[PDB]
Write a protein that binds this DNA or RNA. Structure first.
Ligand SMILES: [Zn+2]
Lengths: 67, 213, 25, 136, 101
RNA sequence: GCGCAAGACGGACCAGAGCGAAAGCAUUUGCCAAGAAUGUUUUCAUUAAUCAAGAACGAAAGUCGGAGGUUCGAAGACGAUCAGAUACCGUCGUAGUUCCGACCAUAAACGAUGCCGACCGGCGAUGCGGCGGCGUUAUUCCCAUGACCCGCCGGGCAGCUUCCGGGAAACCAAAGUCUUUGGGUUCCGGGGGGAGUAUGGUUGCAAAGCUGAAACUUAAAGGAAUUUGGCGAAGGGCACCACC
RNA sequence: CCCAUGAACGAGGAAUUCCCAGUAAGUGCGGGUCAUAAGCUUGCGUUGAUUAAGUCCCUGCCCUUUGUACACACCGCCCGU
RNA sequence: AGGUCUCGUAGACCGUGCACCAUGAGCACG
């Protein structure tokens, strides 16, 4: 990479199904505080409520399958 | 033993005056090592360029062939060699439940240029059309093909290469074909698929001077 | 035993018997 | 050896021919004329195993090596010429092409127009194998 | 016994259909019998599209697509999970499955 | 990357679409010749379908003469796989695969359903020709033309439903109109093997093709469709004696 | 029961077991065995957590569909020299 | 004159592929 990128905050909206081979990961619809328009899908680990605020490092990538 | 990039040069290629931006890239060649010269080895090169890298804001999926045949030092001047289309556009235009019409015309310009004009053509489903087929009869296809043949052999023999290269930059021949063949079958997707150049005249340097302006 | 190779072997046996008959006479 | 004019905001353009089969990955970088190559690396250059010649990891290693090489040479803008094995064989590109392209982009390099230039035939000769095919 | 109303193909008034080669295999399968796959994809899909998006010299540059057509032998079609098998009453559904994803 | 030379093949458009008696037929253009269907208040007036002898055509492979050998590739050579491979796999590779003429007449040549003709439900689309009727377009006015829409007619490739009916059932607008058994007319089958074998005739350069038994042996060999079964078949569900 | 003797053991490879709330774990006390008798088992009580409110990846089980020349039911039937 | 237009959500594939299968000694009872 060799690039700098600021930490961008996030906020979940609706919980989705739980992906992963053993069901470890979880899909969730997650949305940014400072950019109200755009909303992406990210793979999260751990128990998530239905509206808690989340901290995200990279906002470029998108969620996928277990692979 | 020695690094091969020490005895190298750098040269600039020039688009002809029919285009807008004369700078399209740079190439490199070795020095005049021994008896051989670096002038002829820089000659036989084909420079594939896109239309958007030459003009400002137009169709960007048109490709052009440029070939050099004269050098004077730290500079190269090109010439038209052919016109092609990108593969993704060609694969995107073809689809099921429609007909494809293709023809090729061998034409000779006012100069010593034996070109070869290709074409495509695809019929259009109407807006209120319920039928999923939208095919055409064979004689309708023959008439449309003959119309394309006479249109593409109408506009080349009476005029030179420069203004027909100027005419090839926008959609002119395809729009003329689509306007002409509207009564036979309302096709919508007309393009000149490929332009191939077969014969070269005797090369003289004044044409390359006045071609680039 | 499918019929194709059985017919092939029987054809070979018939050819052997016929060519033995023509070497005998 | 280097670009003579100063690059303030502009860039120089070469082409990079990626050729990805199902058992090898070629990264070949050539000038805009198409005749004069500058440096080439293959998937067998960066691994001592004949089976991992078409690998995402070998593609990343080859892409990083060729990106570094054209970085000291002085080319920073690349045109991608992607290619499969073509011909009468399959037309789907190998899995190492995407990883090689991503690793070439991750090195800090500017690209231009990308396309596929695989040699698709109209109708070629008979395919390799029998009528019943390569059954296993 | 008779399995289908047709004979696994679409030949109704022809007798001979120009055979084609398989993609994974090299079987000489007739054209109307082989399962045809037409997939529309692009060069990069999710793992490198943003990485190209902030590494391109042209802004708003749409990625070109790749268009290929695949011919599958029946054994290769079952083995690659392209087509499955249904019950007796559910075999006579000529509609394609709903392509949600 | 630039050209040159040779041979093969015409993708994507390509369809439960078209033509042909059947094998079969896909770059453009030109020439010759043939044909279905549609239309007809044109002509002849019973000239009609089936057909033993006889005759033409007939996929691939195989044979006989030569510049053609690009690719692919029976036999053969090599390396692995394996307990054992002269099999699955990989690299070369002869004869062929290509053309011109002379041969043979065999396929799951299958819609596993001879040909002509009459009758007996509906529906929605497809291809050809003809007919009728609002509207749009080849820009704005008027005609017919091509494209589109709404119906109808005749022939054809086909699709969905059923107490019309049939069938052992799969299924069938034909495989229906059959004990309430007769429209006309060719070929062909009599348990399973032996056996498409022996012999004879016939055709062919050959390979083989057609015609085609007996002795002996056997109580079964077979066709549809249900219930757990068994899949190195595909899914779905459950479990801290499974996992995270 | 009393006094001396004071070894290995420095948190253990491959592999593997048990467990979602007064639970695991630490801790002691009863009963069985008993003339003499608990490093076992069954009950009782004290202190008292980390993690999770899912998955079919592994290990097994169950169901549906499909194929069958198998029905003493694949440890089945079965071809040839 | 305002500055972050409003509402709801599958948008999920993508170096992923597997060798090694020979044989079944038989089989009740009314
Ligand atoms: Zn295959």
């Amino acid at each position: 990479t060799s690039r700098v990128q600021p930490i961008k905050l996030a906020r979940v909206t609706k919980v989705l199904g739980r992906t992963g081979s053993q069901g470890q990961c979880t899909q969730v619809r997650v949305e940014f505080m400072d950019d109200t328009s755009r909303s992406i899908i990210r793979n999260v680990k751990g128990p998530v409520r239905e509206g808690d605020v989340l901290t995200l490092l990279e906002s470029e990538r998108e969620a996928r399958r277990l692979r | 033993v020695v690094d091969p990039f020490s005895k190298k040069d750098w040269y600039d290629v020039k688009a002809p005056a029919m285009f807008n931006i004369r700078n399209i890239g740079k190439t490199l060649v070795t020095r005049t090592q021994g008896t051989k010269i670096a002038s002829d080895g820089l000659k036989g090169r084909v420079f594939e360029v896109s239309l958007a890298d030459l003009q400002n804001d137009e169709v960007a999926f048109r490709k052009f062939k440029l070939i050099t045949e004269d050098v004077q030092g730290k500079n190269c001047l090109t010439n038209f060699h052919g016109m092609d289309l990108t593969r993704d556009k060609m694969c995107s235009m073809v689809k099921k439940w429609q007909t494809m019409i293709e023809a090729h015309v061998d034409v000779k310009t006012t100069d010593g240029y034996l070109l070869r004009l290709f074409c495509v053509g695809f019929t259009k489903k109407r807006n209120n059309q319920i039928r999923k087929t939208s095919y055409a009869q064979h004689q309708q296809v023959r008439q449309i093909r003959k119309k394309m043949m006479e249109i593409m052999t109408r506009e080349v023999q009476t005029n030179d290469l420069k203004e027909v290269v100027n005419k090839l930059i926008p959609d002119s021949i395809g729009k003329d074909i689509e306007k002409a063949c509207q009564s036979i079958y309302p096709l919508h997707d007309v393009f000149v698929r490929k332009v191939k150049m077969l014969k070269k005249p005797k090369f003289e340097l004044g044409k390359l001077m006045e071609l680039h302006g | 035993m499918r019929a194709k190779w059985r017919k092939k072997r029987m054809r070979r046996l018939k050819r052997k018997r016929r060519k033995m008959r023509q070497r005998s006479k | 050896s280097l670009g003579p004019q100063v690059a303030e905001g502009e860039n120089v353009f070469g082409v990079c021919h990626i050729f990805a089969s199902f058992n090898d990955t070629f990264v070949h970088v050539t000038d805009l004329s198409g005749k004069e190559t500058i440096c080439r690396v293959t998937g067998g250059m960066k691994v001592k195993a004949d089976r991992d010649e078409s690998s995402p990891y070998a593609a990343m290693l080859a892409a990083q090596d060729v990106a570094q090489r054209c970085k000291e040479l002085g080319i920073t803008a690349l045109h991608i010429k992607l290619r499969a094995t073509g011909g009468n064989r399959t037309k789907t590109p190998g899995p190492g092409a995407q990883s090689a392209l991503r690793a070439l982009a991750r090195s800090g390099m500017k690209i231009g127009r990308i396309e596929d230039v695989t040699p698709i035939p109209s109708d070629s000769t008979r395919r390799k194998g029998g009528r019943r095919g390569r059954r296993l | 016994t008779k399995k289908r109303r047709n004979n696994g193909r679409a030949k109704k008034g022809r007798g001979h259909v120009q055979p084609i080669r398989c993609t994974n295999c090299a079987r000489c399968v007739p054209k109307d019998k082989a399962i045809k796959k037409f997939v529309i994809r692009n060069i990069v899909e999710a793992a490198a599209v943003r990485d190209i998006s902030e590494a391109s010299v042209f802004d708003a540059y749409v990625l070109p697509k790749l268009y290929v057509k695949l011919h599958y032998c029946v054994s290769c079609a079952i083995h690659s999970k392209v087509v499955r098998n249904r019950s007796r009453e559910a075999r006579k559904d000529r509609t394609p499955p709903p392509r949600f994803r």
